[PDB]
Structures are given as structure tokens and as C-alpha cells.
DNA sequence: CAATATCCCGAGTACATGCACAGGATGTATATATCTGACACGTGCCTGGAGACTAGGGAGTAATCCCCTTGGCGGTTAAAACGCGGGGGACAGCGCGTACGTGCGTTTAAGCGGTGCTAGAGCTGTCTACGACCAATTGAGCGGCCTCGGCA
């Protein structure tokens, strides 16, 4: 039976939890598309004690017009396909986050910040995100990095130079990232235009067509439960669906999702039987052709990037296949990935598949551990004055960050 | 002549209508405007006129029986009228849509310069289609040979 989600927690703090040693403790801000995750670096403690503000990245303002609201509670959100592209709907998302974390007082946030961004970020987008940050909030110095690569940095066996493929899958994108000597080989990195949002959207539209008698009973927040709790990824889809074909297996494995009641009441207050549907929603990232979409999918793409290298460095970078982010949470994901990988390697060769320690939070914990180390490496950060000579389309090439290129944007 | 029916006249009957009222949105009122197109001017075409001639058609007639037209036909139901059934008719309320208002932002119109699409050109330059004629076919009717039924 379905549950309902929680809302409106009580995060309130003093003006700044400044510890011993250096006073400018940075904010660690994972600016996610599904949800934002934000908090103080809190140095000198091994386990990250409190990743506060776990909240959905969505805002309310309706037919009333005169007000808007920002916490977990018609709706809007600041992103287009995992790049932020909104003005004040970004501000009132930052404002919520700062106010609930506490801030000093004066006409700026006194603390430096580390902020996640898109695997590639359009130059205009980076420029705007820098302007909307330095101008309005007055931050002293800033760092941009990629969610996935922070999660890798967290999960590495050692704080040392590495190579691998990162497999990442968030709200509206999945990416395959080849990395060599700690550097993202962004020349031949690739992404797929699908993700967990689109899975839920498909599972919704399926069950709407299965039970037209009660369109209103099924809605995204209930699709979330069946997709998180009750769905799994096949080892081989055309074989799973084949064992699902016989009634004696079906009845033993179909999921009985009881709606809340007011004929045994199921003619409207149905038990929403999900069978094959609990496979067809996860599978979208491996076979986007279950939707209309003609793209290679996470299987053909991995082969298509992996055959663009010399045969020795393939055998190097496949030694660390890493799973992180959103959709990798499905049960069975490691097994499907390592089976699909076994067919596309030399007959006796070796590979290894690692799953992130906490697939959803390790991006933030990574950004924490990174900033807490690189406090004083002033070649890594963008300082407030640099933004006055370099127009905002500028970045500092540390590991776990997008590849910079010399370029400039006309503005007046 | 009797009977069912339509017509006609006066009592008694809700509300419909015509009115008065407040007030609001728009019709007026003035000044300005360019430009539609009025008007004026020739250009050049066809609408018309005007002849000579054949041949196609039209008009006429003649004969006539097909078709219409009529009477009288025989056969069966729409109408008449009644009994008889249920169904169209008159109140209580829910809330869903429609409207309407707000702020939603998509697109068009305009004016910009460049340029290639189309629509008037040809004797284009032929040659599909247009007569012109020939040939095949079927069908129908008229002679001609031959078994049999009713009559000497
Ligand atoms: N436990 C889970 N099982 C399955 N899917 C999950 C789970 N938790 C989150 N998701 C999916 O993860 C996606 C969001 O992941 P996230 O890393 O926050 O995205 P991003 O970094 O792009 O904002 C959502 O589409 C959601 O459906």
C-alpha cells in the first residue's frame, strides 16, 4: 500500500558554526536538478555529520501571483535538462538554502563555496551562474566541479591519480565519462538524453492507459514509490519478460499496490497490479527505443567510446568501471552491467565494476572532502576579483572539473 | 330530423409589458492626413459589321397504333371508435463549467535588401488525337431439303 511523503522540517541555526583554525568555513552545495543538497564543510570530523537540507528542487507560485515558496511542501523548477537557466527561481532556491543554514549579516555571504555543475556547461550558463553568485551574494571565492567526479573522488581506494569510466544517471541525463590520469577526457565523453524523470513519466502514462477509470488516483509522488521500492533491472530483458509470460510465475511475482479505499471496491479503489511494468520502467536507459527515442543506450554507447582507444589503454580504463547517481540505485544494476560488459571484451580478459558507497549522497560527500582538503590552494579557486577581469566564462582546471578552453563572450 | 361538433360571449385570471430610473461607454467633434482613386489622358482590339456560299437542318407532310386513356374491375386495408397502459408532466438540490479577470510572452506586421521563380514569350516543333476509311462479326429472316397425324 502507498505512503505519503514528509514536508516542512525544522532546519534553523546560529549565524555561523565556525570551528577552530581557519575562520572561512566553505559551503558545500550540490545544485541538483531533482533535489538540492547543501551544508557547512564542518572540518576536522571524519564522518560528514550533517548533510542538512535534503529538499526537492521545485518552487510554488500560483494564480495568487503575489508570493512564492521554496521548501519541501501548480509548480516550477529552474533547470532545463540538468543545466540551470532561470533567474529569480534560482535566487529563491539559494536564499532558502542560506537562510536555513544561517549567515553572518552584512551585504554578502562571507564564506567561499563549492558548487556542482553540468558535465559540460554552456559558456553563457557558467557566466550567468557566476554573475548571479558574485553580484547578488558577494562570495569571496568559488569552485565549480562535477557531481559524478566528486563521487568518484570520494570512492577512490586512495587520494591518488587514477583512470576509469564513470557511469552516472540523474534526473534528466545519464553520462559515460572516460577519465585518464585524473583528467576527464571530455573530447570523447558522451551522454544519453534520458533519466529517472522519464522512467516515472513512462510508468505514469502506462498505468493511466491500464486503468482509465481513475486517472486522478495515480500521480508522480505515487509513481516514485513503485519505481524506488518495487522496480528492478533485468539481467537480460528478453529472458526476464519471457519467464514473466507464464501465469503461475506471474501471480507469484506481480505487485499488488492497494490504493486507499473510501463489488470489493477494486473497480475504482484498485490494487493496481504491476507485472511487466516493473521491468519496462527501469529498462529505458538501456533501451531508449521503449520510448520513441533513437539513441544508443548505455550498452552500445559504452562500446562505442571504448573502441576509440588503443587496446592497452582500454584494458587500463576498464579496470575501474564506477556506478553513481540516481538510477544506479535499482537492485540488480551491477549484475546487468557486468554481464553486458562480459560480451564486449577479449575472451579471457579482466574488468571490474564498483558501485558507489551511497549513490545519491556521495556527490555531496565528495565535494565536502575535496573542499576541506583544498582550502588554501589558491590556484584552484576563482577569487572575487578574477571575475572582474575574466567575464565569468572562466574556470581553473582542478581534478573533478569540466575541461576549460580559452574563449570569451561579448557583453555590454 | 338528431346528434356531435364548432362558434361565440362574458368572468375571472398572472404576469408582461411598457415605463421610469441610474449611469456608463461610446458616438460625437475637431484637427490632421495621405492617399485612394477620380479623372483625365491616350492605345489598340474586338465587338461589330457586312458578303458569298454551301449543306445541314428545319419544316412540312403522311400514315398509323402506341400509348394513353377510360371503365369497370375485384380485393383489402387506413379510418373510426372504443377500450385501456404507462408515461410525459410538475418539484427539491450539486457542482461542475462558463465566464471573466490576470498576467500570461508568441507571433505578425513592417520595413529592410537581395534574387530567382514564374509567366509570357516562340513558330518553338512536332504528332496525339482527329477524322477517314476499311474490315469482322453477330444476328435475323428466307429459302430449301427432310417424319409424322389426322383424313379417304
Ligand atoms: N532509491 C532509488 N531508487 C530508484 N531511483 C531512485 C532512487 N532514489 C532516487 N532515484 C532517482 O534518482 C533521480 C535523481 O537523482 P539525482 O542524483 O539527485 O539527480 P541530479 O544530480 O541530476 O539532480 C530521480 O529521477 C529518481 O527517480
Amino acid at each position: 500500500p502507498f505512503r505519503d511523503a514528509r514536508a516542512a522540517p525544522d532546519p534553523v541555526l546560529e549565524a555561523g558554526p565556525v570551528a577552530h583554525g581557519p575562520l572561512p568555513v566553505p559551503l558545500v552545495l550540490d545544485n541538483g536538478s531533482f533535489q538540492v543538497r547543501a551544508g557547512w564543510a564542518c572540518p576536522g570530523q571524519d564522518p560528514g555529520p550533517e548533510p542538512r537540507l535534503q529538499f526537492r528542487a521545485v518552487c510554488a507560485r500560483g494564480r495568487g501571483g503575489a508570493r512564492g515558496a521554496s521548501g519541501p511542501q501548480m509548480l516550477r523548477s529552474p533547470f532545463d535538462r540538468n543545466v540551470p537557466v532561470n533567474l529569480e527561481l534560482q535566487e529563491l532556491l539559494l536564499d532558502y538554502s542560506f537562510q536555513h543554514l544561517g549567515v553572518s549579516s552584512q551585504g554578502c555571504v562571507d564564506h567561499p563555496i563549492v558548487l556542482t555543475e553540468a558535465v559540460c556547461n554552456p559558456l553563457y550558463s557558467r557566466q550567468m551562474m557566476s554573475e548571479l553568485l558574485f553580484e547578488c551574494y558577494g562570495i569571496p571565492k568559488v569552485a565549480y566541479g562535477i557531481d559524478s567526479l566528486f563521487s568518484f573522488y570520494h570512492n577512490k581506494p586512495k587520494n591518488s591519480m587514477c583512470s576509469g569510466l564513470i557511469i552516472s544517471s540523474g534526473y534528466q541525463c545519464t553520462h559515460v565519462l572516460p577519465i585518464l590520469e585524473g583528467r576527464l577526457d571530455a573530447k570523447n565523453c558522451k551522454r544519453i538524453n534520458l533519466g529517472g524523470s522519464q522512467a516515472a513519466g513512462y510508468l505514469q502514462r502506462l498505468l493511466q492507459l491500464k486503468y482509465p477509470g481513475h486517472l486522478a488516483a495515480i500521480t508522480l509522488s505515487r509513481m516514485e514509490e513503485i519505481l524506488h521500492e518495487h522496480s528492478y533491472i533485468a539481467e537480460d530483458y528478453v529472458e526476464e519478460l519471457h519467464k514473466w509470460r507464464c501465469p503461475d510465475y506471474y501471480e507469484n511475482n506481480v505487485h499488488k499496490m492497494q490504493l486507499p479505499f473510501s463489488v470489493f471496491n477494486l473497480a475504482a479503489y484498485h490494487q493496481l497490479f504491476v507485472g511487466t511494468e516493473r521491468i519496462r520502467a527501469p529498462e529505458i536507459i538501456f533501451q531508449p527505443s521503449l520510448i520513441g527515442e533513437e539513441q544508443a543506450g548505455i550498452a552500445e554507447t559504452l562500446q562505442y567510446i571504448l573502441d576509440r582507444y588503443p587496446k592497452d589503454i582500454q584494458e587500463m580504463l576498464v579496470q575501474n568501471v564506477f556506478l553513481t547517481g540516481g538510477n544506479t540505485m535499482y537492485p540488480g544494476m551491477k549484475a546487468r552491467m557486468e554481464k553486458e560488459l562480459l560480451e564486449m571484451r577479449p575472451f579471457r580478459s579482466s574488468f571490474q565494476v564498483q558501485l558507489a558507497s551511497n549513490p545519491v549522497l556521495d556527490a555531496w560527500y565528495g565535494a565536502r572532502d575535496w573542499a576541506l582538503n583544498h582550502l588554501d590552494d589558491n590556484e584552484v579557486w576563482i577569487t572575487r576579483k578574477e571575475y572582474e577581469e575574466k567575464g565569468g566564462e572562466y574556470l581553473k582546471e582542478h581534478c573533478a572539473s569540466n575541461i576549460y578552453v580559452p574563449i570569451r563572450l561579448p557583453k555590454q
Side-chain angles (χ1 to χ4, degrees):
Chain A
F2 296 154
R3 315 182 194 98
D4 289 342
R6 291 188 176 276
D10 298 335
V12 178
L13 294 175
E14 298 186 311
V18 177
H20 307 283
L23 303 177
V25 177
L27 282 308
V28 183
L29 179 55
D30 181 20
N31 180 35
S33 176
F34 176 64
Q35 69 173 193
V36 172
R37 295 161 291 237
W40 294 104
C42 198
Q45 299 193 4
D46 291 351
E50 300 294 353
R52 292 181 170 99
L53 306 193
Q54 304 293 327
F55 77 104
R56 189 83 169 72
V58 72
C59 302
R61 57 190 190 170
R63 274 199 160 189
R67 293 184 175 186
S70 184
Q73 291 180 336
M74 61 196 74
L75 295 172
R76 305 289 183 262
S77 178
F79 293 92
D80 182 1
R81 207 198 314 184
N82 272 49
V83 61
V85 76
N86 189 298
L87 302 183
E88 77 278 4
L89 217 78
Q90 184 58 259
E91 294 188 333
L92 65 92
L93 182 56
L94 288 171
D95 285 356
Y96 175 92
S97 74
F98 287 130
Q99 197 280 344
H100 285 288
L101 285 175
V103 166
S104 60
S105 73
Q106 69 168 344
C108 58
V109 182
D110 298 325
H111 305 85
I113 78 162
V114 59
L115 179 75
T116 61
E117 60 163 9
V119 163
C120 282
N121 198 354
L123 291 164
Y124 298 93
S125 167
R126 189 177 287 137
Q127 191 286 330
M128 294 161 195
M129 182 72 261
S130 72
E131 180 178 314
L132 277 47
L133 182 58
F134 282 127
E135 302 297 0
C136 289
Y137 300 89
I139 282 69
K141 65 175 184 164
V142 168
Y144 297 155
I146 301 165
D147 36 55
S148 317
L149 283 64
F150 288 121
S151 77
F152 185 72
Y153 183 113
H154 187 272
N155 279 276
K156 287 182 180 178
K158 295 184 177 181
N159 302 336
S160 66
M161 307 310 290
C162 292
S163 55
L165 294 174
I166 311 303
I167 294 294
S168 60
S169 48
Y171 195 54
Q172 289 271 27
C173 273
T174 79
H175 313 262
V176 193
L177 319 172
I179 74 191
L180 295 170
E181 300 169 307
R183 193 56 50 189
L184 202 187
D185 189 14
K187 179 176 177 181
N188 61 48
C189 179
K190 307 285 175 165
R191 86 190 164 235
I192 297 158
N193 291 321
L194 296 91
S197 179
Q198 311 222 17
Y202 191 68
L203 179 51
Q204 176 168 259
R205 191 60 169 134
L206 264 50
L207 292 174
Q208 285 184 199
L209 290 179
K210 194 170 187 177
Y211 303 113
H214 47 277
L215 298 185
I218 58 177
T219 187
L220 287 311
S221 61
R222 288 171 177 170
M223 304 292 88
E224 297 308 342
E225 283 215 309
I226 51 182
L227 194 138
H228 289 58
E229 293 266 49
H230 301 306
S231 299
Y232 72 92
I233 198 78
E235 284 200 41
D236 47 338
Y237 179 40
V238 292
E239 197 281 347
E240 275 287 291
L241 73 86
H242 178 92
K243 63 161 70 77
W244 272 93
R245 193 178 65 187
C246 70
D248 52 358
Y249 180 86
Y250 184 97
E251 187 277 342
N252 198 28
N253 290 281
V254 63
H255 263 218
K256 43 175 170 280
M257 292 293 101
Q258 309 80 1
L259 280 168
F261 279 18
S262 183
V263 177
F264 312 101
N265 298 296
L266 311 187
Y269 302 107
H270 208 289
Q271 295 207 4
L272 294 176
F273 289 123
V274 281
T276 306
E277 301 87 344
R278 85 198 285 233
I279 308 305
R280 289 177 76 165
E283 287 291 321
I284 299 306
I285 64 178
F286 292 84
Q287 313 214 352
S289 58
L290 266 45
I291 326 298
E293 197 71 345
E294 57 281 81
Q295 280 203 336
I298 202 172
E300 291 210 307
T301 47
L302 177 58
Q303 188 183 251
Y304 177 82
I305 74 171
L306 189 56
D307 84 7
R308 311 200 71 73
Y309 287 131
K311 292 182 181 178
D312 58 341
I313 73 184
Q314 293 180 25
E315 290 185 22
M316 185 211 292
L317 63 91
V318 160
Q319 199 64 25
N320 300 299
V321 186
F322 184 65
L323 282 163
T324 189
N327 293 105
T328 68
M329 284 292 293
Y330 296 142
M333 185 72 175
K334 186 182 185 170
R336 170 55 160 286
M337 190 53 70
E338 81 186 340
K339 190 203 68 80
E340 217 285 306
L341 191 58
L342 184 61
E343 164 167 355
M344 53 175 283
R345 285 283 88 204
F347 162 57
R348 291 300 197 183
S349 62
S350 290
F351 54 77
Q352 188 58 285
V353 177
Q354 179 73 351
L355 181 68
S357 303
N358 186 305
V360 53
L361 294 180
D362 285 353
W364 186 88
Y365 287 122
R368 190 203 74 136
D369 289 1
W370 180 90
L372 175 158
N373 276 274
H374 299 293
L375 287 171
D376 51 347
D377 293 335
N378 290 312
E379 71 275 32
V380 167
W381 300 80
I382 303 168
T383 324
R384 176 58 184 78
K385 74 176 194 289
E386 295 174 75
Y387 164 70
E388 302 193 333
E389 55 165 79
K390 308 300 189 277
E393 72 272 43
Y394 176 70
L395 190 52
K396 306 295 291 193
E397 285 280 273
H398 56 287
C399 68
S401 75
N402 170 254
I403 298 300
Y404 174 71
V405 63
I407 197 61
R408 276 195 173 261
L409 303 181
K411 180 169 173 172
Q412 295 187 357

